[PDB]
Design an enzyme around this catalytic site. Sequence first.
Site, short mmCIF file in Angstrom:
data_model
loop_
_atom_site.label_atom_id
_atom_site.label_comp_id
_atom_site.label_asym_id
_atom_site.label_seq_id
_atom_site.Cartn_x
_atom_site.Cartn_y
_atom_site.Cartn_z
N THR A 159 0.78 -1.24 0.00
CA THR A 159 0.00 0.00 0.00
C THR A 159 0.80 1.28 0.00
O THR A 159 0.71 2.07 -0.94
CB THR A 159 -1.05 -0.04 1.14
OG1 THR A 159 -1.83 -1.19 0.85
CG2 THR A 159 -1.91 1.17 1.12
N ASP A 261 -9.35 -4.09 -0.71
CA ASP A 261 -8.24 -4.79 -0.06
C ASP A 261 -8.67 -5.47 1.24
O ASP A 261 -8.32 -6.64 1.48
CB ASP A 261 -7.13 -3.77 0.22
CG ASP A 261 -5.96 -4.33 0.96
OD1 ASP A 261 -5.01 -4.82 0.34
OD2 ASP A 261 -5.93 -4.22 2.18
ZN ZN Z 1 -3.61 -5.27 1.70
#
Ligand code: ZN
Length: 805
Positions: A159, A261
């Site tokens: 990320t 996510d």
């Molecule tokens: Zn992740």
Amino acid sequence: WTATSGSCKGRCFELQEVGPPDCRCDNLCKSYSSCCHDFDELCLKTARGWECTKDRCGEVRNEENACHCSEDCLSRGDCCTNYQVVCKGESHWVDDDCEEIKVPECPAGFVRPPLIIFSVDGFRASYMKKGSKVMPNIEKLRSCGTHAPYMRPVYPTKTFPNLYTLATGLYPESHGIVGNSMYDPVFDASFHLRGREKFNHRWWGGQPLWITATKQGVRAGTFFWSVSIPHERRILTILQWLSLPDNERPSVYAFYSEQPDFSGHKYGPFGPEMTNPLREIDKTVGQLMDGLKQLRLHRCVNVIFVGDHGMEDVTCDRTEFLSNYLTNVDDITLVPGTLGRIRAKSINNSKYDPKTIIAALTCKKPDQHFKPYMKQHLPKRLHYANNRRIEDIHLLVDRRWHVARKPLDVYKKCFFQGDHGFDNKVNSMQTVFVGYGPTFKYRTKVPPFENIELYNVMCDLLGLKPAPNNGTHGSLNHLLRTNTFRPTMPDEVSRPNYPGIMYLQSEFDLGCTCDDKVENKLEELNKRLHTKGSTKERHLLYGRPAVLYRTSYDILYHTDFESGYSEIFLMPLWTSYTISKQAEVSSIPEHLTNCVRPDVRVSPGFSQNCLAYKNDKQMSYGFLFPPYLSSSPEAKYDAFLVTNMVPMYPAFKRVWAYFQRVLVKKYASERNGVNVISGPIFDYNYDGLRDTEDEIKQYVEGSSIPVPTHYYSIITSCLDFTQPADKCDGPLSVSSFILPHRPDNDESCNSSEDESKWVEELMKMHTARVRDIEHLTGLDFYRKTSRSYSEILTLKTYLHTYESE
Ligand SMILES: [Zn+2]
Ligand SMILES: *[C@@H]1O[C@H](CO)[C@@H](O[C@@H]2O[C@H](CO)[C@@H](O[C@@H]3O[C@H](CO[C@H]4O[C@H](CO)[C@@H](O)[C@H](O[C@H]5O[C@H](CO)[C@@H](O)[C@H](O)[C@@H]5O[C@H]5O[C@H](CO)[C@@H](O)[C@H](O)[C@@H]5O)[C@@H]4O)[C@@H](O)[C@H](O[C@H]4O[C@H](CO)[C@@H](O)[C@H](O)[C@@H]4O[C@H]4O[C@H](CO)[C@@H](O)[C@H](O)[C@@H]4O)[C@@H]3O)[C@H](O)[C@H]2NC(C)=O)[C@H](O)[C@H]1NC(C)=O
Ligand SMILES: Cc1cc(OCc2ccc(=O)[nH]n2)c(C(C)C)cc1Cl
Ligand SMILES: [Ca+2]
Ligand code: NA
Ligand code: NA
């Protein structure tokens, strides 16, 4: 200490951060534990939810409500996003036909179309097609705007490294966010996802877009949103900012979603549980577009829909444990998961040895799911070495797997079904790009590109000068209707010498021998023509490469190849040759096996010598233009010139010989001819940039012959393979590699087998952009083509990934 006694009255989501200890009402106040006492009450209203209903229309304004449906809400800038649809008979943006936005259609006082970056965490590229039925707003942005089939993230595919690359245009080794977890040994400080240290400014290098804008007088909204602020409130805040007076209003905004996510880690990338998070992200896009439509901004704002990385199926059982390899497992610290980084547990332990740890990790188990590298030996396309926060020992983990120190780490430190972090060429790690608005093209599909390129484009969209970065500015001009950046080619710094015949054979004492004294106006005039460049147009197809630094070098012409010979490094910087589809492969004749020939155009003092190789027991030599592809027995002698020789470890010669003898012909057959440029690369400080002569750490023993760290080849042909590489009227096609020049083949676990079973696999792992080669060599390629410069810039950023469809 925070004096939480102040008030957020009229300060909610204020753009300027007030300095300690006064209480804050900006978005980061949650993160710092510093919000004023009444921040939740005033700034995070939820009363009556996020949507107008018929009965609320023209209501009396009640300031308690999360959003409003009163007649005054438009001028207040705070209607619920569906207000005009519920109350004023309007359509949702998604229900409206696509109509080209030929020019910005902006309300008065707008100096430039605003840019809104809508970022989604873990949004895998294939969701655009696979989830299109449940994402009508996203599908309209995609189909009506400009979209790529996927966008390549940076390594590691985590990320913060990727979001910060989006913000800066920099590789993680340059911006400093090299993982979601880090130790910096100069600071003696640790960065973690949880906690306060991660906000310290010393972690964050380069210059992100919001700082670029602010320095150049363009105001920016919040990029980092606190997790506990709901998405509907993020959208409402953006829309409220867009209603500010001209002089106060930001021009650049970001939205961020933790989905998909969050659910992808729990359910895997295609878990049935994933449809709902996708619907919800779409609904949020719809809120934003409806809101822009209310403000009459839906044909003024440029919107970018972009992800940070994808998501792969990964479960607890697919974990490799270092305790099954290492005896000393307690003397290391491992950063674990979808990549591994290893360092010593204690800097006082002098029994710590990287070489024995690498060796204990190399090809130890038949189906081993990770490979160890010293960071300088990782594929150069990862650009993941030049930062003290990147540990010397790196494990590249196969997709679908984890690495951990010990089993107890995986149950006492299965839950999850998805993860990401793997090599950024892996298909499941690819993510999304859509641009929609007046500045982007209409219904236009562009080829996949890398996320390092976006900062420049975002700067172009805002009229900003980008800070120095790793994008190649102009390479994405084909995404844009207007605001293109029109670069000029860099200027050549060093002009070549063109030496003629200047030395007699007896002036050389190189310790070389060749069986070549074997003896005509028919054939002598012709060979003189070849040495003056008469075949150059066949072998140098796109002009000679420009040398962008100060050095001394000679152009050398031959029947079958042209080279740029460095008098400083004693070898070619580049060697260029064309191999048609019809070309034949021949062997090195028995009498020429050890043949090396002085080059009478180049002085003894600027030549390599055979004695050095004789006496260097570890080092052998190879040739850049391959003797196997000579056009005739007589032209073959040119390939054994001392000026075409380069130092090669025996182990590397296995790789190189198979490339030259087998693979070049295979590519010429498949691609209808290829043009090949090959050469050495010296990058001993692993900074991705050409070494100067005083940075060279290894020479052929006893000599001034520098040993390359890598060998590259650029292989170009016609995109329309009906035309031969040497008669191409249109766009080009390229693949390149940067092979590490290593004294063993420990990287290839199957190297005891025939080269046909392992060499091309190695070469694929070390695929490269022509731009990577430019940085590493100070050369500029494709200087003379019939193509537009922006088209050539896109070609130079191309990476051939060899991943399936
Ligand atoms: Zn992740
Ligand atoms: C990708 O794009 C980027 C951006 O264009 C490229 O990075 C640039 O590359 C240049 C060459 O490597 C580099 O130039 C150096 O700048 C030094 C000034 O440094 C500071 O100022 C800049 C500008 O504001 C700033 O951005 C720097 O930020 C770095 O460091 C901090 C922490 O210290 C981090 O927060 C940040 O993330 C960043 O770190 C990254 O870069 C540094 C190197 O700067 C690495 O060490 C890190 O690992 C990390 O990757 C700095 O705050 C300047 O001092 C240098 O000058 C030396 O060398 C020149 C050669 O021309 C010479 O003339 C001088 O004498 C000088 O040498 C003296 O110092 C030597 C070292 O101590 C010593 O050995 C000598 O004897 C001398 O005394 C140099 O010019 C530039 O900083 C970066 N910019 C960025 C943002 O990284 C990158 O190359 C591209 N990648 C590819 C593959 O193309
Ligand atoms: C578009 C964008 C978003 C963004 O952060 C969003 C975020 C991430 C985690 C979180 O918890 N909250 N918000 C960043 C960060 C600041 C580097 C850069 C860029 Cl370019
Ligand atoms: Ca270097
Ligand atoms: Na030798
Ligand atoms: Na091997």
